Design a binder for these strands. Structure first.
Lengths: 107, 95, 80, 92, 96, 82, 107, 92
DNA sequence: TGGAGAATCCCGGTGCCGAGGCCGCTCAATTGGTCGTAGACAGCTCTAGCACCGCTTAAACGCACGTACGCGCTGTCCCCCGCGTTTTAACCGCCAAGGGGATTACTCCCTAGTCTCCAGGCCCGTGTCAGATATA
DNA sequence: TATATCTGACACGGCCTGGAGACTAGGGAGTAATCCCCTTGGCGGTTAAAACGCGGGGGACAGCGCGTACGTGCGTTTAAGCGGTGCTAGAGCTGTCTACGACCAATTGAGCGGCCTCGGCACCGGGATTCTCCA
């Protein structure tokens, strides 16, 4: 047998192709799972994770903190319209709400 | 040196909208959860994480309901929220 | 018994301040208690059903997460 | 042996925000987010397989699921990233 | 001559269109609207007839439910007239 | 090329849809907002239906695609298959 | 051999136990399906079919119609609280709406 | 060829309302209702089996799926006829 | 308060087409037997959830003052409803091309299954840095 | 906003199990071909509905008075909350066995496609019953 190379390194990803393939196989979705489906879904999950972490890090530097807390994730999700559409039925614990006051209540 | 009626409410809004801490005391919510769960199964154990999950979900639901209630109140040209606003919000949301 | 009164008037006021409500009527609190009772009854009944299917006498946070996911109220950060 | 996506979110976070850490509750949230998006996309791919009388999930099914679920720019960039990963896997 | 008061004809129309189950939007303009919407996505696209009636039924039901919530919003503002802020309030509360 | 057929959703048709919902009086600014609401909803359904058709490598949008598109967004329609 | 007895006949049901069993196997739900699961599912489906059909026949008899139309099914579902809770997200085609004029609009 | 509940809903109608017929569109609506409720209960039972690390959908999973999905009196009754049906099937 | 144009309800005749009953058959449900394995059940650990006392202290509760605000009344004017006339595009029928859905043969590449091997992720331990506290 | 301190969560550093390499087999889906439902473009009458216009009436909207009921501050109560200890249900893991469900094969009758029929119901026309507006 030759040297063992991981399937995530062949696709240039950090998310596991093999774990995603195993979760697709035991999750009872279809009778068969193709070769490119775990690669594709690992790439999609890596991109969505990257987008959430970029906006969370920007929100963390906006509050002068170098560690991401749930409040930074909530400010990351709900200030972007696409992630608000994706996570509209999702409650983030210890996330709070964005500060909005309607204009009729201002003095 | 009494403040105007409304400015302490506005500082309360800006204080509780900048915070993540739960606004309900933990022990009355524990007693309420156990009292409700007594009607479905007698002598249930409760994890602490389950009660914290219930409190977080209930607080988020009530905050969203009060936002919709405030929207109904301004739609009725009014600052004070009333039970008819809560009823209208739950009727439109489907409850 | 009578544990719905533990959800006090300042707690409902605090939750309305988080929602951006500037002025609150005196009849908000009974309605909020009833709304919270209905929501907790639904989620607790579903979590109790999830627990009694698993032959357990302890309501795990997984059961609460799945009970909220059954109603489209997905909760993050509690092992979901 | 509870499997989690913690080290991968470490790797992505250090890849794009090198001088930025993360908390434990934020990782519980991120783990739940990855699991939720995975379950959503895989369930839609299963529905796409059953509607067209197919027994396999391919890259086309995951592509169509990503186009159905994710909003516009998110769907476009996710499809681009997945197609790049698939052609990098196939060419190498 | 004979002239009805404002509201009696509207209430009779409400009773007629609540008793009936017929489609109220004309079929051919709805088909043309469906085709011009679908031509922005994929060119040279055909449609089954049952797809167009399914779209018409879903659209009519959604608009009728939106008008019910709009009427409740208009009554909440001490009015009997529906105005666009009632529609915007109903869609904001639903989450659209 | 079909252009500007949103005016085919006429003012009496919107009035009839409001009469079905139990509306006594309608302002004159309602109709443009109703046309916009109908257009937004129709693009949301039709994009998913065209996606379902394109996955099957077909050129005709069927009633199955519309039923699955409405079932996806929680607006399930009975009577057109399932 | 023996006489071929239908599984729905020995369970006292009219809905097909074997078809529900086949659809449970081929529906990619789990690896195994128990024996009592299709019997239970056919019983619940038959009960819900009977509950809709009884109220639809009552609505047809109240409208002096021999035959159940989709308007009768809509009048059956939306006038009962439990069936409207079950089918609140579902549109019945050619079903119309319930006659409900608001009190402030009537003179 | 095409498979639907074209004879069992008529059987239930004849044993409930023996002098009442059904139209084609109403029967298609009833077939869609049966398929939708079947999909809901089967998906809930599959999700319950996956939550408890089980590879089998038993009568207990269908019972708790019916208790989860249906409202109160409907769930209590449907549990009663389901229990009666499995008891009659096992006893005969 | 009572009368008239108009809508509404009720009843009888007519035609139609769509559900509904019946038959051939084929295909999927039924029966019979085998085997492996998922799960039922007992045993045991030790995690964690309930129970309770002290205290000190933040949070809640009651009371009083008062001013912003809800709410009702009035006026106005304007905008939408009601209805007559016109025009215009929907609708139905019949109609042909002709693109594409749907079926069938085949054949091949893709993916399940299996044995082996090893290295990546995971539990545990440690120490060190990022916020919260503290004060002006 | 600026200057010191503390602490507790967090990033880094041996075994085991699951992911990868190589091979085999078989079956699902791609490709080609064909056949016919069914989809669209179009002509033409027609008549129903959309559009336009005019009067008017009722209701959206603005202003104003008033009476009251939440907001706010302060003093007193009370029980959340943290620490600490104790103890016992029961969550969870492991081992063993046994019933039960997948699987394969032969049989057979249940349900579906196809076809013929008759009455339920929409439609038309006439008569009785409100019904809503106005003097």
């Amino acid at each position: 047998r030759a040297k063992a190379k991981t399937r995530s390194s062949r696709a240039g990803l950090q998310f596991p192709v093999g774990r995603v393939h195993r979760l697709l196989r035991k999750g009872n979705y279809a009778e068969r799972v193709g070769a490119g489906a775990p690669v594709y879904l690992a790439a999609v999950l890596e991109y969505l994770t990257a987008e959430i972490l970029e906006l969370a890090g920007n929100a963390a530097r906006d509050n002068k903190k170098t560690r991401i807390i749930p409040r930074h994730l909530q400010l990351a999700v709900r200030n972007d319209e696409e992630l608000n559409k994706l996570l509209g039925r999702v409650t983030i614990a210890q996330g709070g709400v964005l500060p909005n006051i309607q204009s009729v209540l201002l003095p | 040196h009494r403040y105007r009626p409304g400015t302490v409410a506005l500082r309360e809004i800006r204080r509780y909208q900048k915070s993540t801490e739960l606004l309900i005391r933990k022990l009355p919510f524990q007693r309420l959860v156990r009292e409700i769960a007594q009607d479905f199964k007698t002598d249930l154990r409760f994890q602490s994480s389950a009660v914290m999950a219930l409190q977080e979900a209930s607080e988020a639901y009530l905050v969203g309901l009060f936002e919709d209630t405030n929207l109904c109140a301004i739609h009725a040209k009014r600052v004070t929220i009333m039970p008819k606003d809560i009823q209208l919000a739950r009727r439109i949301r489907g409850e | 018994r009578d544990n719905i009164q533990g959800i006090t008037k300042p707690a409902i006021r605090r939750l309305a301040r988080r929602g951006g409500v500037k002025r609150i009527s005196g009849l908000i609190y009974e309605e909020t208690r009833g709304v919270l009772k209905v929501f907790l009854e639904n989620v607790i009944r579903d979590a109790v059903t999830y627990t009694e299917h698993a032959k357990r006498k302890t309501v795990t946070a997984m059961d609460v997460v799945y009970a909220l996911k059954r109603q489209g109220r997905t909760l993050y950060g509690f092992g979901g | 042996r509870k499997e989690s996506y913690a080290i991968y979110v470490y790797k992505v976070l250090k890849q794009v925000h090198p001088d930025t850490g993360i908390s434990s509750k934020a990782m519980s949230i991120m783990n739940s987010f990855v699991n939720d998006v995975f379950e959503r996309i895989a369930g839609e791919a299963s529905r796409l397989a059953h509607y067209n009388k197919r027994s396999t999930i391919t890259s086309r099914e995951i592509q169509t699921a990503v186009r159905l679920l994710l909003p516009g720019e998110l769907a476009k960039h996710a499809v681009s990233e997945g197609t790049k990963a698939v052609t990098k896997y196939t060419s190498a």
